[PDB]
Amino acid sequence: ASPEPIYATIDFD
Amino acid sequence: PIYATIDFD
Amino acid sequence: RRWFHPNITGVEAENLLLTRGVDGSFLARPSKSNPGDFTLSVRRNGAVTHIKIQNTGDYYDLYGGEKFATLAELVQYYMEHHGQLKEKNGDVIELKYPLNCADPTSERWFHGHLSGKEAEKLLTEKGKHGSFLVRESQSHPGDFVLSVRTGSKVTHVMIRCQELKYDVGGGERFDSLTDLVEHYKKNPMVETLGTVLQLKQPLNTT
DSSP, X not given: XXXXXXXXXXXXX | OEXXXXXXX | OTTBOTTOOHHHHHHHHHHTOOTTEEEEEEOSSSTTOEEEEEEETTEEEEEEEEEOSSOEESSSSOOBSSHHHHHHHHHHSTTSOBBSSSOBOOOOEEOOOOOSOOOTTEEESOOHHHHHHHHXXXXXXXXXXXXXXXXXXXXXXXXXXXXXXXXXXXEEESSSOEESSSSOOBSSXXXXXXXXXXXXXXXXXXXXXXXXXXXXXX
């Protein structure tokens, strides 16, 4: 099948 | 939240 | 039926009534302070008021006044008979425009139920560098996800929703999904591992 989607984190200044 | 009392008196 | 909202709080009702509402807008919802009673949330003069509705089991009333078998008959009544709904001071409250339950946005880049693998798929074979969309979260019901193409792959960014207030894990909290998308169109967000996530073009739903 297809690979697991990985969510990301945003860097807030 | 503000709750209004309804007057039937 | 249309103006009833099954699973919202008083704060999401106010924020609904101020964003998508006008003066005279109203909605019904269950009571959170006291289930299972109900609440008329209504907008007047730019502010939001809530009215308790009693459910004994045999009838619905505003803890007084007329008794109705159903919730819709009570609302319909108080829509048709303006004046019948008076605060103690003297000011009457008007039920003029129902606020119909609807999507979080009407914008086309909102795909709704759409998983990360199928969103990844569309964004591969139809998205270009900067194509993005917002979609419901399937690992956190009630929350959303912004999927972006940063070409040569796709990123997902959980958009939290707390009381009809949206952010991407912190920073500013917008009143709608639109304000968030536009603000972060002007103001690209930077992912922890360096990738900068510009939003060039929405991949609208067909």
